[PDB]
């Protein structure tokens, strides 16, 4: 709550979230969304972000030392 950061998700956050999730998927991690034959791990994570299912929670460290826990689903992505 009382979060002051922008509701949108930055490009840097999107790249890291997908990259980390894609690495996790390649390590026998479970997939929340249904699988329709997408072999490449990046595609699996890409649709997960679209469906707002990625468990990763972004902890944005403010310059003053405070941190805000912003969920990927809560953040507004651009498609």
């Amino acid at each position: 709550q009382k979060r002051i950061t922008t509701p949108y998700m930055t490009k840097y956050e999107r790249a890291r979230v997908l990259g980390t999730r894609a690495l996790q998927i390649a390590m026998c991690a479970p997939v929340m969304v249904e699988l329709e034959g997408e072999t490449d791990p990046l595609l699996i994570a890409m649709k997960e972000l679209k469906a707002r299912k990625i468990p990763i929670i972004i902890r944005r460290y403010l310059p003053d030392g405070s941190y805000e826990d912003w969920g990927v689903d809560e953040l507004i992505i651009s498609d």
């Binding site: 690495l23 996790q24 998927i25 390590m27 026998c28 991690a29 479970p30 468990p55």
Partner: peptide, 8 residues
């Protein structure tokens, strides 16, 4: 913890 253990 390995990502393999990211189940329920």
């Amino acid at each position: 913890l390995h990502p393999r253990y990211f189940g329920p």
